[PDB]
Amino acid sequence: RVASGAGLPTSRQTTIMVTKYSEKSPITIPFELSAACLTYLRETFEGTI
Amino acid sequence: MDARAVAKRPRDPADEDNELVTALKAKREVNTISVRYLYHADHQALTARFFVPEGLVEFEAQPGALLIRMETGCDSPRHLYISLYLLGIRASNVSASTRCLLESVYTASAARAALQWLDLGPHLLHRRLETLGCVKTVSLGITSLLTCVMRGYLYNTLKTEVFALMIPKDMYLTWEETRGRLQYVYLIIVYDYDGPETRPGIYVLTSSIAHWQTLVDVARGKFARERCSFVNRRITRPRQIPLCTGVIQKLGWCLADDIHTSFLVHKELKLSVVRLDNFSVELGDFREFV
Amino acid sequence: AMEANIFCTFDHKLSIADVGKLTKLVAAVVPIPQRLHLIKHYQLGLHQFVDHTRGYVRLRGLLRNMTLTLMRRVEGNQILLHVPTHGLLYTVLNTGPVTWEKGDALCVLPPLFHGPLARENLLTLGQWELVLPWIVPMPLALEINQRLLIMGLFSLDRSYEEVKAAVQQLQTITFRDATFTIPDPVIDQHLLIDMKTACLSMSMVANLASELTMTYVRKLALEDSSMLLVKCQELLMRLDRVSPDDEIARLSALFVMLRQLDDLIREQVVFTVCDVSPDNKSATCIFKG
């Protein structure tokens, strides 16, 4: 506050409270895979070059 | 609880420090504000503060004068804080020379407006007016901020010197040839129920009488003509409603020795007054008598 | 350094919502039938005196002699109450429907709004409902007393439309930014008992004072040392243009009907506003008892 002059309107003691919040924004970039890469990676084939 | 603590002597308030002194002393800092002696702490006189326009605060710069709020059915400025002298302008009790004197000082746009609001409505003054007590300090601003008291003595800050109560000579009224050790001061608004004028009479009663019946007996005995005028207006004019031919309330009590004649000066205008130096206000509601 | 207070307790359980409701009424007036020290919650306010058959006048008669107090603080342990004293200032809430100004003479009134309401939903326990008396400026209290008495006086002629128009005129009351109305005292086309005896005593003292006056001024006229007496009898003689034990009984009857009307013909100021806070929820007023 500022000390006002004599006879002037004064200023009162002021408390003030603000409450910020949060948002939600979940993201997703899905990817697909063919059966060829899963079949030839997760399963073992014969010994050929 | 202990007999040591119960039979312990009571604590002197002036010997113990303030709450701010021990609060600053606990955490041990220093501020530029001097705080070790709070002012107005030993003040039994409960006071109040009032804003009022400039047009009513003449003959008020000297400390000590009554202050009366009024009611007006207009909404925004509804309550004016009128001094006692502007009230005495309207009154038929005051002498016409002094009337033309103190009207000549109160030439203001607010004062004449209050004078119109006094006699405009159908109500009498005692149902309209309401005291506040006596004033002790001024602000003298573009609007004035007076300090009145409800109960207690009238004194300057630090109690360096006492403040007196002023009353003009025409409102002054005693009913005994000699006074007691103590005497109360009252307010009297007596109604002349005459045909041409209904302007009242304003009085203060520096009397040593406290009991209300023994006060109202002497009040009827001194104002028998006014009650006769009341009952004459009752018999002459039918279907009118007159009430409260006089009203009475307690204002305070004085020392009964400092009562003396002084004068007020405002813009080199003398106005002779009865002055009561050591006086404490004591307010009360408007009782009435017929 | 403690002060002399009153420790009031609650035998019902109290919610945190009810504690937060109770802490809104910090500077609230509470009447108490006798200033004890450890009082229960059953004697806070006027719910001890809520009655279906009784009315406003007996509430005013009880409130003339109740010990009014102020609250200090609310705790999960207990509740603090403060008895005021004369010549000291206190903060007091404006729970009344009318805003105040500085220097207004204030006095305590029984609540016109009764029973369940959107404003009377304060601290309501199971069998208990905390009610608070109103703190009204003095001329509005006088207006309410006069208007309620005269609305009680028109109880026996509600069949006439003109009397209903006069009642509807009386039932609305204006004030400074205040246009509240009051409930009519006649219910079930009958009047409650205290208001009935009050207006009956009013009519009785009016009838007896109209009756006995001429004989008394005729007796007083033969010692005429006061010229007010002859115009006093001339008033009654222009208005018209007995056994001695009957006289004694009529005098005692007139004075007892006046004595039963003592609380209504006058009242005392309780507070006067030293200053008023902004928003007009509360004001600092000096007690006057």
TrEMBL record, chain A:
This is Major capsid protein. It comes from the Viruses. It comes from Human cytomegalovirus. The chain holds residues 99 to 147 of 1370 of the full protein.
TrEMBL record, chain B:
The keyword S-adenosyl-L-methionine does not apply. GO terms for biological process: viral capsid assembly. It holds the Pfam family Herpes_VP19C. It comes from the Viruses. Keywords: Capsid protein, Host nucleus, Virion. GO terms for molecular function: DNA binding. GO terms for cellular component: viral capsid. InterPro entries: Herpes_1 (IPR004999). The keyword Electron transport does not apply. This is Capsid triplex subunit 1.
Automatic annotation (TrEMBL), chain C:
InterPro entries: Herpes_capsid_2. Pfam families: Herpes_V23. One of its GO terms (molecular function) is structural molecule activity. Keywords: Capsid protein, Host nucleus, Virion. One of its GO terms (cellular component) is viral capsid. This is Capsid triplex subunit 2. It comes from Human cytomegalovirus (HHV-5).
